[PDB]
Design a protein around this ligand. Structure first.
Ligand SMILES: N[C@@H](CCC(=O)N[C@@H](CS)C(=O)NCC(=O)O)C(=O)O
Ligand SMILES: N[C@@H](CCC(=O)N[C@@H](CS)C(=O)NCC(=O)O)C(=O)O
Length: 158
């Protein structure tokens, strides 16, 4: 427990730096880009949960659920902005895909990563799991680009 916390704290910045180097669809496969942005978002979800555990006892999650959901949304926006900048010089012969990832896909990966972590602590996060679970289908009805299952593949490896 104290060993896991030490490892997350120690490797946080380095892991994020490393993942950020594999987001360029010009040189990387789409599967790689999706996996690495997802691993970034999952890392962020763990940091999120750590930060929530140290909120005052009266600052319950059901008390201000807009705050937490917006934090989650802002995470997707920020990772998406990073991804955009990293893919700015993309050309027609890019290895990754014909299309650089829409914000819908980064959003989907974000909600996925947060759900996986937040379902482990339902007693704390039952107010949020409602809105996030719909957003998944809200986005799954917004864009089933087939590649939706290629996103599910990136959220799968252990
Ligand atoms: N992410 C690289 C491989 C490099 C690698 O494995 N190093 C980092 C990820 S950038 C790491 O922390 N290892 C994998 C993990 O622990 O999830 C790739 O997809 O080809
Ligand atoms: N502690 C985070 C790593 C991120 C981090 O280093 N930031 C804060 C977390 S709010 C920190 O300095 N750690 C103090 C703590 O959680 O005891 C984690 O468990 O993943």
């Amino acid at each position: 427990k104290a060993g896991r916390n030490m490892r997350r704290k120690l490797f946080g910045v380095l892991r994020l730096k490393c993942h950020s180097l594999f987001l360029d669809l010009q040189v990387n496969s789409l599967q790689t880009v999706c996996t690495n942005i997802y691993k970034i978002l999952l890392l962020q979800a763990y940091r999120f949960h750590a930060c929530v555990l140290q909120l005052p006892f009266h600052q319950q999650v059901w008390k201000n659920p807009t705050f937490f959901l917006r934090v989650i949304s802002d995470t997707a926006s920020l990772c998406y902005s990073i991804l955009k900048a990293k893919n700015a010089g993309m050309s027609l012969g890019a290895k990754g895909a014909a299309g650089p990832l829409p914000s819908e896909a980064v959003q989907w990966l974000c909600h996925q990563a947060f759900l996986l972590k937040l379902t482990r602590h339902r007693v704390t996060y039952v107010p949020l799991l409602g809105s996030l679970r719909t957003a998944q289908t809200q986005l799954s009805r917004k864009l089933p680009g087939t590649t939706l299952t290629a996103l599910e593949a990136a959220a799968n490896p252990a």
